[PDB]
Each structure stands twice: as structure tokens, then as C-alpha cells.
Point group: C2
């Protein structure tokens, strides 16, 4: 009546894919941010830049958390299976 190892393993994959995709978006859009900012005079873009730079470490930290949950879920599914045997 709790989650099976089978299901925990599959949920883990969703966290892993979530981590990878957030990291890839952050990478691509960091490059875009730099190019836009470098080409735009005056401060029309300045607040967007400031907010992006403040939020990006938190988004990176979240992506790493998702990968840490994925790993923990795989270890837990393993553990459940070991008891079941």
C-alpha cells in the first residue's frame, strides 16, 4: 500500500530529466542574457539582468536538488527491494 520499488525508480527518472532540462535552459538563456546585455545601451534591460543574476544560483541549486532526490529515490527503491528479498 506504499510505493513499489518499480514505481520509485520511475519517479526518480522524472526528477533526473527535470534537473537536466532546467540546467540546459539555464545554460542556453545565460548565453542569450550575456549577448543581449552586451549589445544594449542604457538601462532598459538592467532590471531583467539584475533579477536573472539573483535567481540563477537558486535555479542551479534546485536543479542539483532534483538530481539529489533522483539518487536518493534510487537508493531507497534498492533498500525496499533488499528487505523484500
Amino acid at each position: 500500500i506504499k510505493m513499489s520499488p518499480e514505481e520509485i525508480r520511475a519517479k526518480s527518472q522524472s526528477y533526473g530529466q527535470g534537473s537536466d532540462q532546467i540546467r540546459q535552459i539555464l545554460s542556453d538563456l545565460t548565453r542569450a542574457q550575456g549577448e543581449i546585455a552586451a549589445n544594449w545601451e542604457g538601462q532598459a534591460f538592467s532590471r531583467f539582468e539584475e533579477q536573472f543574476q539573483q535567481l540563477s544560483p537558486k535555479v542551479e541549486k534546485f536543479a542539483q536538488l532534483l538530481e539529489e532526490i533522483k539518487q536518493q529515490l534510487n537508493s531507497t527503491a534498492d533498500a525496499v527491494q533488499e528487505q523484500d528479498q
Copy 2:
């Protein structure tokens, strides 16, 4: 009459804007699916060890939601800016000549 210059074509600005829009929607979808997942994990393990991740997820998710919102606002600004670049080009073109 004029704006502070952006040294980028309307075509590239709109191409970048698309990527911000896509990034925003994707992050929003991920956060929603994984918030549902966190719900189910928490239902099944309550203790201190899982609590570490539960607490970090909860503290970081609103920041990630703010980041997705930010990305949509950048998409929107870039679309407005591309329009503006074209408009100023038009005006300069229009008023050209002796």
C-alpha cells in the same frame, strides 16, 4: 526621435524571445509535475532524511517559479523591443531626404 540603442536586428531579438518563452513554459511544466511528485513521495516517507529534501524543495520552488515568470517577462520585453526597433527604422526612413 529615438531610444537608447540595441545593437541587434529585430529578427534575432524575436528569435531570442522565442527561446525565453519556451524556457518559461518548460520550467513551469517541470515545477508542476515535480510538485505533484513531491506530494506522493511525502505521503510515503515522512522522516528526517527525506525532510531535508522536502524543505529544500519548498524553499526553492517559489524562486524557480519567479524565474519562469521572469523568463516570460523577458520574452515579452524582447518582442516589444523588436517592434520598437522596426518603428524607429520606419520613422528615420520616412523622414529621410533633402
